[PDB]
């Protein structure tokens, strides 16, 4: 049929974004704090959790 | 630095001596912004200090720089026109 | 009545409820037969229903419908040259497509709009017959029978009211073409009124640049010549007698640079008026104030035409922006190679006033990159302040990876193969990886060429080379003169100007020679080496550890790094020995690449690729024979085989070859061919003069979607390579090659197809001049 | 070999070459290479035993109308412009009115060549080339030019008496609106497919009625070159619209007696009560003058390059730019003859004058024809 | 593709090739189903299986075409939480992909475009749909994607430190700051802002950053 690295092929999927890269907020002193959240940077940690990542099925 | 030519490095954004004399301690930011618009650098978390800092280095003959700040107060009324030379 | 139930027959694209809402009576509404006939027509107002027979069972409605919708196919027949989709676009304009609502009414309406599309083509002599062919369960095939007669073509243009310049004079300036004799072709003559509109503006310039500023084209009357091909134009103009640029009075917000702006408006008061220069001279202010920070310098001129002396008076009104527009910049299409790699290819810095051309200079470095497909940007003014412009450099990148081939034979010969593989912008780093080598039963070879182009940011291309030629000639090895060669070179770059860049490194080689051949020039360099190795034998071994300083410099004002169409690049490269070397010589060569647009649209472009060189000793010990110059085969001159342009070595009266085998490897060995024979492959000279001249040529059979990556290019390739020390006093009874006229020649075309492994080029070329004999393969397969 | 090169689709050929009453030439001659395949409204005028004919690059030859022996010759080849000795390039036809030969030229010029020698007894530049033949009448050289300008030039010395914009869209809807005179009115059609009457004396519109279509949004062909020039039987305007659509109107008010908004006609004459015509399909029919009742037809010419229908030698005669001539039945449409005297053909009109049938050919020029 | 067949016969043949993984021939069914029968009762679920087939065939814009189709076919549906995830997830897959990862080269400083197009729709999922099995995973992606664009923009911020336009350093750093409140790439842009001030001899403004550094030494 096919061949790739002595397998057939390799398809797309991720758990790396599920690994959710570490974020360390500012402890910045008063009068030395920027408006440090702008844009669509708005992540409500919401949970209908279900399967997640590659285990998350998609229909 | 035993080289003579360098590909010339600049950094503009500077209120010239006209732009210094155009404005005065007491002006609003707007009073400067009608002529001189925004700065490309202000205070991020303090007062309204409008920074306009020139830099340039031509030819291993040193670097030049003209560091201009415009400290408007919390109300934006100008309180300091500090233009600093190189170094 | 009042309907208790509607019977919903035959809908098949619309729903029952979607029918029911298109029915003015819904199930339960009071019902008139007026409303029933309204239910007839408003379901015809679906556009989907062939017939609508609304009736009722007393009051219980029933709607008998066979239906128009989803078209299963639209068959294009007669759509030879005009694209299906072009013809489909008028159909796609007509609200009907495959899977849409048919209407058997709008058949000629689509067709007329297609002849109205034919009207726009450059013809009307073409027709279309759409044929409805009903298909299963509602469906319909739309067979479009195209009755395409003919186009139109430019036949004549009468310009009345013109008395200054001749009409056909102007037609020669006009892209409306009409001259191809049967023995004189300059192209073709075919028609568009859009050329006409531009050639009206070619005319509109054509009086204006003189001084005619009350020049005005009154009207233009093109023929309905009764042939459906004939174009006879009756242009009405007013010649509009000339005016003089009698003065400039530039004004407005001149932004304190008006003296410089006055240098852009240094005119002659009373010169014969050129509005196009005036059009240009407005923009001269705009780039200037652009370079002065003001990205938006509104400059409006007004040549106040004074007819009382036949002059104009150029009012200009200027209004600049503010300086510090360059706030920051953005980049897009940086999705494989590093953003900061593309950010360092710019020249306008953020946190600054604008120098307008540094963007374009920065975009030219990206245009001179060659990992790109196009280089563009977005120079939006971010709203909010007159120091607020970000520049969003959206660009497009190109594919990489390449191959070069070489083989004698597989699975029946020995382990013999030539390799080579290329990976540049190596994993999105900008690094170039090009590595080759070969292992055969003649020799073994290893080589590397990998650069860190920005190991240091100041142009510092950390490019190192190593090679290991275990060159053996494994057929009679000791008699076939084994010489293993290996050595190093690391080379570096720096932008000495911002379009000029230097190259420099140290070259080392470790040649290890053994039983040199009885060639005359072979011992002759060894004679200049101070050696006196024996002509009549193959007996002598030799090592050299030559330490040279190689160098270079790159000029770069040519368009693309991968597919240019305009400009030139100068790349001088050479080497000179240092003390510590086993020989004191030099070796310099010259590399040329210029692109001159034959077509101003650059469809044809002169491709001037010539090669030059000279290397000699530094006194005493000569330049080695392996540093000679050549051509032939895949080279400047192709249609040949390799090493056909140069000196051709004579052998010596010689027996002991170490036994070159039994009438094999004749070098005037003892096995036949003795006593001073001469080879015909070019062993090459210490001077190079070769030149290849090529032409970008568009094909009409590959679409320029994917013909634009293909450069078909014809050539008449020729050149001369001679050795200044190949003396006629030493080479008289065998041919001499110290003349700087040794013109071999072969002419033909190359075949550049751009594959996913990059451009792969073959060639066919025909030699008709061979200076002192050339091995010629007319079919040439380079990449 | 050539079996697989390219493709087009086009017209139908000529059927029925007939020789029932076998035709001939009255004489044969030439005036150079004349009106040509280049579309131009030049054509000779036969008068006074003088073949007033010109080739459209040069010589205006008076030939004798017996043998085509030259009576005089001058050349209207332009000695002036951006260049000396440029060709003639004439747009309007030969108008011999009094002692001048008036010809509208593609140099946007109208001349008056003195009929005794051809000396241009006056010359006048006009507003564009003469798209129609200049109707030289009442001292008014009345032209429908390529811009549609009703111009009146003094036919005595050259003096524009008015220049009034005629009816044609922006691009030249090439086709005649030749200002033919009726009842002291300038009776003009229009290349938009309208029809009008204007004042003959000053160029003041008596009326103008739209008849039918034109190019643009009811788009008609590039072959559409239709004489909107009327043949007004005294009070009844018999004209075509620019798409060939025939009609009958009032002369002084433009009130429609009848209208063929079905007309597709190249060339049209009113022959008694029988409008004889050359269709755009080149089918020769006979419509009425109190309607469009087909009195007879002939499809024995189909998609030809026909000239105007004329009656000569006892037959309706039509020729073509295919070079055929044909002697149509005056009744139902049968060729009683066919005369192949050219094959380059005729853009000029069959002049049944001097008892001849005068045609300058396109390139193999002037013949005269009889039977 | 698939000829005129019963829609359920096409759908059952799809449901083989969806369970087969044969998206090549499932989309051959599922499209030619909705090419002839987009009025199917499962023509919502066809698009739900199409995006399922497309993205698993890695047909991300054709997924996005079917997504926008399912946006336009079913703007009211339970699986728009799937779609608003899939709007992010296709843009998550649209952003960056290469063979270099087996050898150790990364792209989080290459494509910001579909990164933010993922961040828009993933956050539109976790705002608009807290109910889904997608709203927790995408939240983790969004936590990852904030630092991903930070690693992009810090790589930009590292560049202008090398350029010598020290306004252009600190403008990226407040761009690092005001967009990313918490990323380490911002926390390491926090030295670059003060040092660029020390280049412009704005040491006084640089020491205000040093207290932030002293605060975010924690």
UniProtKB/Swiss-Prot annotation, chain B:
GO molecular function: protein-macromolecule adaptor activity
Topology of the protein relative to the lipid bilayer: Lipid-anchor
UniProt keyword terms in alphabetical order: Cell outer membrane, Lipoprotein, Membrane, Palmitate, Signal
GO biological process, one term: Gram-negative-bacterium-type cell outer membrane assembly
Annotated localization: Cell outer membrane
GO cellular component: Bam protein complex
Main location: membrane
Entry's family note: Belongs to the BamE family.
Stated role: Part of the outer membrane protein assembly complex, which is involved in assembly and insertion of beta-barrel proteins into the outer membrane.
Subunit text: Part of the Bam complex, which is composed of the outer membrane protein BamA, and four lipoproteins BamB, BamC, BamD and BamE.
Protein name: Outer membrane protein assembly factor BamE
Full-protein positions shown: 24 to 110 of 113
Swiss-Prot record, chain C:
One GO-annotated biological process of the protein: Gram-negative-bacterium-type cell outer membrane assembly
Domain POTRA residue range list: 1-68, 69-149, 152-240, 243-321, 324-398
Compartment(s) of residence: Cell outer membrane
Domain of life: Bacteria
Keyword line: Cell outer membrane, Membrane, Repeat, Signal, Transmembrane, Transmembrane beta strand
Regions annotated as coiled coil: none
Main location: membrane
Complex and partners: Part of the Bam complex, which is composed of the outer membrane protein BamA, and four lipoproteins BamB, BamC, BamD and BamE.
Alphabetical list of NCBIfam families matching this protein: OM_YaeT, PRK11067.1
The family this protein is said to belong to: Belongs to the BamA family.
The name this protein goes by in its record: Outer membrane protein assembly factor BamA
Source organism per UniProt: Escherichia coli O45:K1 (strain S88 / ExPEC)
Gene name as annotated: bamA
Swiss-Prot record, chain E:
Disulfide bonds: none
Main location: membrane
Domain of life, per lineage: Bacteria
Keywords: Cell outer membrane, Lipoprotein, Membrane, Palmitate, Signal
A GO biological process held by the record: Gram-negative-bacterium-type cell outer membrane assembly
Compartment(s) where it occurs, according to its Swiss-Prot or TrEMBL record: Cell outer membrane
Annotated PROSITE patterns: PROKAR_LIPOPROTEIN
HAMAP family given in the database record: OM_assembly_BamD
Function: Part of the outer membrane protein assembly complex, which is involved in assembly and insertion of beta-barrel proteins into the outer membrane. Constitutes, with BamA, the core component of the assembly machinery.
Family membership: Belongs to the BamD family.
Protein name: Outer membrane protein assembly factor BamD
Gene name as annotated: bamD
